[PDB]
């Protein structure tokens, strides 16, 4: 498969799974499915790529289905970025 070109959207309020992880449920809005979801976590400084993405190689099968992505965010403020470019969705998350 290949990286996904288009935009994404969040389908549900992010939930804490409390094995230490957080799940993000996202929908693919552009074209080129199936494809890989371009996702990365960012620091409080909003530039360096910290943390880790649990779900091994998340896949957007189609434009209707929701991709479930588990991840390990650092305590406090973190920025989750889904997709590429300026229509990259950016989620300011806070871990307690």
């Amino acid at each position: 498969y290949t990286m996904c070109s288009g935009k994404f959207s969040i389908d549900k309020e992010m939930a804490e799974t409390q094995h230490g992880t957080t799940v993000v449920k996202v929908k693919y809005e552009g074209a080129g499915a199936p494809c890989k979801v371009p996702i990365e976590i960012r620091d409080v400084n909003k530039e360096k790529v910290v943390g880790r993405i649990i779900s091994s190689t998340p896949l957007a099968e189609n434009t209707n289905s929701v991709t479930n992505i588990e991840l390990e965010p650092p305590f406090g403020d973190s920025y989750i970025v889904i997709g590429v470019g300026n229509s990259a969705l950016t989620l300011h998350w806070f871990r307690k």
């Epitope: 959207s9 969040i10 389908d11 549900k12 309020e13 992010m14 449920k25 209707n64 289905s65 929701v66 479930n68 920025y79 969705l89 950016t90 989620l91 300011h92 998350w93």
Partner: single-chain antibody, 228 residues
Framework: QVQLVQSGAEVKKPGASVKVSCKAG???????MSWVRQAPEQGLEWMGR????????KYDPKLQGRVTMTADTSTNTAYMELRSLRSDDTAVYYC?????????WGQGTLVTVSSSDIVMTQSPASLAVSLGQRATISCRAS??????????MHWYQQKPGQPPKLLIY???ELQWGVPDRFSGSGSGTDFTLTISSLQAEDVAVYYC?????????FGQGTKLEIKR
């Protein structure tokens, strides 16, 4: 291609209860299923939303106690039960899906009965502009509508006897297929929808909507018309 099919239009006596079904072509477990009512010639009123994964139901305070929203994740069907019906409740009952705007809607079910709190302010109530000319509709929320660093403000178009159409979501993001001439700006509390060049297709009612925290209140609507 449409993913929501609703039950047939029911006629009920005052004081009765009604149950509307909504069958989805996708897995409702990973989704926010909402119900929206629309009285004849009045605006859109959000009723509530269910998370079918955990059955979590949040309702609108207007209807609180009268509505019961359920979901069967096995049959990917969502339900809505409304009790102690008044002639008042005669409306079209829409079944919808999504968080950053309701991208997916049902055909509607006409129910005919016969024998934190936020204020969303849409301006104007109606307006006429000439073809090809620029048109602007505004929405002002009483509180903040940001969440996760994004403004959860959406815009809908609704032509008569038709379900609404999500146009703009996440304040500025344009839904797939929507013409270039449509645009959304704004932040914090003031947002605006703008049609750079008015086309005859655009004559419709427009609704703005918040979705960051419940209720997912709609604006009162803006009837857009042609001059001359």
């Amino acid at each position: 291609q449409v993913q929501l099919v609703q039950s047939g239009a029911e006629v009920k006596k005052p004081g009765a209860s009604v149950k509307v079904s909504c069958k989805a072509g996708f897995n409702i477990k990973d989704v926010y299923m909402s119900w929206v009512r629309q009285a004849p010639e009045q605006g859109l009123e959000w009723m509530g939303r269910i998370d079918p994964e955990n059955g979590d139901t949040k309702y609108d305070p207007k209807l609180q106690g009268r509505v019961t929203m359920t979901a069967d994740t096995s049959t990917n069907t969502a339900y809505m039960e409304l009790r102690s019906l008044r002639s008042d409740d005669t409306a079209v009952y829409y079944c919808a899906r999504g968080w950053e705007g309701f991208a997916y809607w049902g055909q509607g079910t006409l129910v005919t009965v016969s024998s934190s709190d936020i204020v969303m302010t849409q301006s104007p109530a109606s307006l006429a502009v000439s073809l090809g000319q620029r048109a602007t509709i505004s929405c002002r929320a009483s509180e903040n509508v940001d969440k996760y660093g994004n403004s959860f403000m959406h815009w809908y178009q609704q032509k008569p006897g038709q379900p609404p159409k999500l146009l703009i979501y996440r304040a500025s993001e344009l839904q797939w297929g929507v013409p270039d001439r449509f645009s959304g700006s704004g932040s914090g509390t003031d947002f605006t929808l703008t049609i750079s060049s008015l086309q005859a297709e655009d004559v419709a009612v427009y609704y703005c909507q918040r979705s960051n925290e419940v209720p997912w209140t709609f604006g009162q609507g803006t009837k857009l018309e042609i001059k001359r």
